[PDB]
Design a protein around this ligand. Structure first.
Ligand SMILES: [Cl-]
Ligand SMILES: [Cl-]
Ligand SMILES: [Cl-]
Ligand SMILES: [Cl-]
Ligand SMILES: [Cl-]
Ligand SMILES: [Cl-]
Ligand SMILES: [Cl-]
Ligand SMILES: [Cl-]
Ligand SMILES: [Cl-]
Ligand SMILES: [Cl-]
Ligand code: NA
Ligand code: NA
Lengths: 574, 574
C-alpha cells in the first residue's frame, strides 16, 4: 500500500522517430493500473512549480494510479524542436498509444494539469484514442486565437504574448545542450521584459522583436503576423471538434484568468455528450490566493487544493476505474460567487434560470469620467444623446486587473479609481442598490458607436462600486472594429457612420450587495491587456507610433440607439 | 541513475515507545547513501504546501541522497500527543539515531526546511548526534520567546499566536482518528479567526480562548500565561547552546519574515565554529514573490528556488559527501539589498565596515503626524523639546506590513500613509537625499521617554519615503516598559520619570536613493503584530478592555536627552 517508484527519463518514440522524455510514477503493487498523463513544457522534473495550482497528485499515485509526466518536444530531456501547439496533437496521440502498450497500464488513461498542461489535454482528446477515458483541463482553452493570444474581439493580447515568450525563452536557454556566450545577456534582456511588460509592449513597430523573434520565431511568424482568425489558427483550433467528443472533462477556471471565456465555452461544448464538471474560483493566472491589493475573498477562496485532489480522484475513479457511485454528492457545477464571497453548487452553466437583462446607458450631460452624468437603468433612455472622447494611441487607458496574465497579473479585482479621471473613460452607474443584484453568467454589451477613423477599438468593463469608493473590476472585453462582424474576413468602417457592435465581456459571478452600485466603463483602449489600435486601418503590428492617428470616438445612447450591457441576472428568494 | 522509490508510513520508535511515521525517498542504486531529514507538523504527504518556499529537493534524491520526511508526534500518521516544541529535541535525536542504523544510510545525515521545519533543525543540532553533519534552517529561530511568540521587546506577538494556533487546530482536527460531531462547527470558527485575526486578537480578556484553548491548551498554558522570559521558555530555548556547536548551517531569512531577527542571530552564533552561510531575501512568511501592493522588488527577488536547490546541494555535497571544493565560488553571505533591488554577496554578517551611526530626533514644534516638524539628523539637536500624545488601548495604531505572519502577512513593505494622520504617530524625517544612503545591518533606537502610567509600550519603525509619497515600511520594534532592562525580571516605571530605553528594530538592507527620505515613526502600539499594553502594570492578557487605562506618553529630544535611531551605515564608493 502507498509505496511507489519513480523512473526518470524513459524515452518514448514519436511517429517521426523523435523521442520525448517521461518520468514514470508507478505503484509498487503488481498488476496493471490506470494511468494519468501530464504534458509539460516547463520541465517534468519541476513538479513544485505547477502542482500547487492543480492537485496533490501524489495522492493519486499512493491510491494506485500511475502518473506519467512528459517534457514536450524540444524542451529539457526531450529530443526534437519546440514550437508552441503544432506538435501536441500528434505527440499526445503517440504518447497515449505508448502508455496503453505498457505492462503496467490497464487500458484506462486520463490527464490533468493547468494552462499549457490543460490545452494539451484538448489536443489529446481529439486524437480518437479510445483508451483516453477522461481529462481534467484547468485554466485551458480549445481555441488558441480566442485565448490566450487574441480574443473574441480581435485584438492581440500583447502582454500575454510577450510575457509567455520571455518565460519560454528563459526555459529554451536553460534547456540548452551547451551554454552559449550570448546566453547571459539574453537572460538579462528576458528579465527586463518580465519586469516591464507594458514597456516591452510599447515598442513600435510591435512586430520587430530582435530578442524574442530570435529565440522563438513563432512569436512573430505565427502570432503577430496573423491578426485575422485565419487558416493558420484553425489548424491548431480544437473547438469545433469538441461537440463530437464523448470524453468526460473536469474543467477548472478562474474569473480573473486569461483563459476563462474559453475554459467556460469548453464546458458548454462537451456537457451534453459526456460527464462534464465545472469549478470556477476568483483567481488570476498568477494569483490563486484569494487575496488582492484592494479585495480579499476570504480563506475559502484560496485555491482548495485538498478538495480539488479529492474531486479529481473521485472523477478518475468513476471514469478510469468504473466505480459507478464515485461521484455521488459531487455537484455538476461549483462556483465561487463573489460579493457574498461563497462557494455555491449549481446544476448547469449557464445557470438554468438566467434572465439576460439589458441595462441601458443614459444620463444628463456627458458621461466622461466617474464624476460625469452616466447612468445605467433597466429602462430605455428617453432622450437621444452621445458621449464623445479623443482616443490617442500614444496615451492608451492602462490595464488594471481583469484577466492580465503577465503584466501585473496578480490583482484581478483591481480598484479602477486611478483611471476614473480620464476623459476617455466613460462611466455609467446604477443608483446605490437597496437590494442585492446577482450577476452570474456570460456578459456582453451592445453599443451604438461611431468614429472619425476607419478603424478603432471599443472596450467595456463591468465594475462593482463599493461603499468606501473602491471601484472593483469584474469582467471586460474589447471589439476591434474591423472585426465587428467576423474575426476571419475583416472590413473597415466609414468615418462618422453609426454601427451597432457587440463586445464579449467573458463571464463573472458577483452579487452586488446593498450599498453598492453596478458600473460600466466604456473606452477605446486597455493596454497592454490588448494592443493599441492605430486608428489607421493598417497592419497595426507593423506601424510606428508616429504614423498612428488619434480618433474622436462616440457612444450613442437613447431610444433609437439603445446602447446597453446585457447582465445575466439570477434572482433567488427561497 | 535518477531512479528512486518512495516507502510510505515507515514507523520509527521513539525512546518512550511512541512511533512516528516517515516517508522514505531512496535512490534505487545499491550501497548506503547520505540522508536528509525534514520534520514536519503539516503532513509529510503534503510536500507541495511547503516545498515551494524551500527547495526542489527531489533533485537531491535524483542526485543520490535519501530524504526522510516525518510527521511530528501526535499529528497525521504519527502516534502520541502533539504539543509544540517540547518533544522535538528528543524525537529528533531518536529519529537521527534510527536513520543512522539503517542499511541505506552511510553515516552522514543533514536537514533542511522552513519555519517550524527550520526550528526543528536547531532542536536536532543540540542533540550531540555526530552523524548530523549539516543543517539548513530557513525562516527559523533558536529562541521561541524572541521569535515567533513574543520578541526582544517583551510584547506578545498576538496575531502570530492566534493565527498559527488556528492553522494547527485545522490540522489537529483533520488528523483525527474519527470525525466528531463538533468538528464542522470548529472548522467554521477556525476559518473566522483566520479571516479576521485582528478581530480575534481584540477580544478581552485575551487569555480566554474557548476554541483555541480547547483544541490546543498550550496556547494559553504556555504562551499567553508566561509573558516573562521565564524558566518555561528557557527549557525550549536552544540559543545559548549554539555557541558550543560546530555544525555547518545554511541559514535563510527574509527581511519581512517574523523570524528574521532570530534567524540572523543564529548565523552570528554559529559562524565562528563551523561553515555557516546566510541568504536573506525581501520576503514575508506568506509572500516570497517579491511583489507587494505598493512595492515591487523585481523578478530577481522572487524566491530563487532553483538557485537555492543548487546551493543546498553544494552545501550538502561539501559536508555530507566530503567534496572539499563543492562550495567553490559560493559566497558566505548573500543579501537582497532593497532600494537598488539587487542581490549582493558579502563576506560576513554584520557587514565588516558597518558604521553604527546615530540619527537624532529633532525639529521645531510638535512631531505628531507626518505633517509635523519632526526631523532626523546626524547632529545632536540644539534645543530641549518633547513630543506628547495620548495612547488609548481601545484605539491602537494598526499594524501595516512589517513582519506580520498571519494578519495581512503578505505586504511587508506596506505604505504607511494610512496611519500618518494619527496624533499618536510621531514622525521624524531627513531632508530629501541628494546622495544614496545604504543601511544594511541590525537596527535599534535609543529613546528618552516618560509616561503617565506605570507601564506602557514604545514602538519605532524605519521607513523609506519615496518621491511619489509612498512611505514604505522597512523594520520595526517595540519595548514594553516593564521589560526595559530585562525580559526575565520585570519592574514597573514611575509616572513622569524619564527613562532611556532601547528598542530592537531587527534588521534591514536598504539603499535610500536620491529623492528619498529616511523616516522614523514612534508610537506606543502596533496591533495586532503586538498585543496592546493596558497601561496598568497588570497581567495584560487577563484584563478586560474597560479596565485598561489611557496613557499620556512623551518622547524627549535635545542635548541632554539625545533620542536617536542607530543606523548601520554602509558606504561604498569603489
Ligand atoms: Cl475586500
Ligand atoms: Cl472564507
Ligand atoms: Cl464558502
Ligand atoms: Cl437619459
Ligand atoms: Cl467599502
Ligand atoms: Cl516599487
Ligand atoms: Cl529583477
Ligand atoms: Cl539581482
Ligand atoms: Cl531641534
Ligand atoms: Cl516614487
Ligand atoms: Na480559466
Ligand atoms: Na527569517
Amino acid at each position: 500500500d502507498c509505496n511507489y517508484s519513480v523512473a526518470c527519463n524513459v524515452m518514448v518514440p514519436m511517429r517521426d522517430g523523435v523521442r520525448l522524455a517521461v518520468d514514470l510514477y508507478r505503484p509498487d503493487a503488481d498488476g496493471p493500473v490506470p494511468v494519468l498523463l501530464v504534458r509539460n513544457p516547463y520541465d517534468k522534473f519541476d513538479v513544485f512549480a505547477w502542482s500547487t495550482q492543480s492537485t496533490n497528485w501524489l495522492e493519486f499515485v499512493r491510491d494506485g494510479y500511475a502518473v506519467v509526466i512528459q517534457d514536450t518536444r524540444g524542451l529539457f530531456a526531450s529530443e526534437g524542436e519546440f514550437v508552441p501547439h503544432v506538435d501536441d496533437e500528434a505527440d499526445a496521440e503517440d504518447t497515449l498509444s505508448w502508455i496503453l502498450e505498457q505492462a503496467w497500464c490497464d487500458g484506462n488513461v486520463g490527464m490533468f494539469g493547468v494552462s499549457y498542461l490543460g490545452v494539451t489535454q484538448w489536443q489529446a482528446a481529439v486524437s480518437g484514442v479510445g483508451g483516453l477515458k477522461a481529462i481534467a483541463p484547468s485554466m485551458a482553452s480549445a481555441d488558441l486565437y480566442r485565448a490566450p493570444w487574441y480574443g473574441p474581439g480581435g485584438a492581440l493580447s500583447v502582454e500575454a504574448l510577450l510575457g509567455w515568450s520571455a518565460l519560454i525563452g528563459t526555459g529554451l536557454i536553460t534547456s540548452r545542450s551547451d551554454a552559449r556566450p550570448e546566453d547571459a545577456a539574453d537572460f538579462v534582456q528576458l528579465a527586463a521584459i518580465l519586469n516591464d511588460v507594458a514597456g516591452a509592449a510599447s515598442v513600435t513597430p510591435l512586430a520587430e522583436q530582435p530578442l524574442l523573434g530570435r529565440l522563438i520565431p513563432w512569436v512573430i511568424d505565427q502570432v503577430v503576423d496573423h491578426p485575422d482568425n485565419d487558416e493558420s489558427w484553425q489548424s491548431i483550433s480544437l473547438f469545433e471538434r469538441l461537440g463530437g467528443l464523448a470524453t468526460p472533462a473536469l474543467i477548472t477556471a478562474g474569473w480573473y484568468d486569461g483563459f476563462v471565456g474559453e475554459s467556460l465555452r469548453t464546458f458548454v461544448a462537451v456537457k451534453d455528450n459526456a460527464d462534464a464538471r465545472l469549478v470556477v474560483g476568483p483567481w488570476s493566472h498568477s494569483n490563486l490566493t484569494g487575496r488582492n491589493a484592494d479585495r480579499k475573498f476570504g480563506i475559502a477562496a484560496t485555491y482548495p487544493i485538498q478538495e480539488a485532489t479529492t474531486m479529481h480522484k473521485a472523477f478518475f475513479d468513476r471514469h478510469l476505474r468504473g466505480e459507478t457511485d464515485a461521484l455521488a454528492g459531487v455537484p455538476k457545477v461549483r462556483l465561487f460567487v463573489m460579493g457574498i464571497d461563497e462557494w455555491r453548487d449549481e446544476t448547469d452553466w449557464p445557470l438554468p434560470d438566467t434572465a439576460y437583462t439589458p441595462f441601458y446607458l443614459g444620463g444628463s450631460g456627458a458621461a466622461n469620467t466617474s464624476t460625469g452624468g452616466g447612468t445605467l437603468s433597466t429602462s430605455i433612455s428617453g432622450t437621444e444623446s452621445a458621449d464623445t472622447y479623443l482616443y490617442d494611441p500614444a496615451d492608451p487607458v492602462p490595464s488594471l486587473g481583469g484577466t492580465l496574465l503577465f503584466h501585473n497579473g496578480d490583482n484581478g479585482p483591481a480598484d479602477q479609481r486611478p483611471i476614473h479621471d480620464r476623459d476617455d473613460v466613460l462611466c455609467y452607474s446604477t443608483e446605490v442598490l437597496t437590494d442585492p443584484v446577482e450577476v452570474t453568467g456570460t456578459v456582453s454589451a451592445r453599443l451604438f458607436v461611431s468614429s472619425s477613423a476607419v478603424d478603432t477599438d471599443f472596450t467595456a468593463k463591468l465594475v462593482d462600486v463599493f461603499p468606501d469608493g473602491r471601484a472593483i473590476a469584474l469582467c471586460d472585453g474589447i471589439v476591434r472594429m474591423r472585426y465587428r462582424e467576423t474575426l476571419v474576413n475583416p472590413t473597415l468602417i466609414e468615418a462618422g457612420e453609426i454601427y451597432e457592435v457587440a463586445i464579449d465581456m467573458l463571464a463573472t459571478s458577483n452579487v452586488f450587495l446593498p450599498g453598492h452600485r453596478i458600473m460600466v466603463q466604456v473606452s477605446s483602449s486597455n493596454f497592454p491587456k490588448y494592443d493599441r489600435n492605430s486608428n489607421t486601418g493598417g497592419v497595426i503590428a507593423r506601424e510606428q507610433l508616429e504614423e498612428m492617428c488619434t480618433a474622436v470616438n462616440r457612444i450613442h445612447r437613447g431610444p433609437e440607439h439603445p446602447s446597453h450591457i446585457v447582465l445575466p441576472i439570477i434572482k433567488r428568494k427561497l
